[PDB]
Amino acid sequence: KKRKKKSCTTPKKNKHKRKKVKLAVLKYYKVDENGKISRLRRECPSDECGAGVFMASHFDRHYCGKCCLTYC
Template sequence: MAAKDYYKVSGNSIERANQFCPRCGEGVFLAEHKDRRSCGKCGYTEFKK
């Protein structure tokens, strides 16, 4: 994904489209899957309910 796909711009505000990894910190996004969110760097996984 390109960097522009990680953010949403509306007017003068910028919002993150995905969450940051709680282990790696800001700058490393969690990938969105159908049933989970996962970090490609450290392997952290959150399962959706």
């Protein structure tokens, strides 16, 4: 039995390529004229990411990337 080649299918299933955000770390904190620090998003109650990591604001939800917590 000589192995058949037979490569045909839906032409390409592309693998997700990383979205590169340039200096996206800066967007989190808001600095006023005095030098004050204003946090624009919400802190996460979970243990591991506690006080060191913030959440995400999506229109209907709040999402932390470490423990994958979700709120409405």
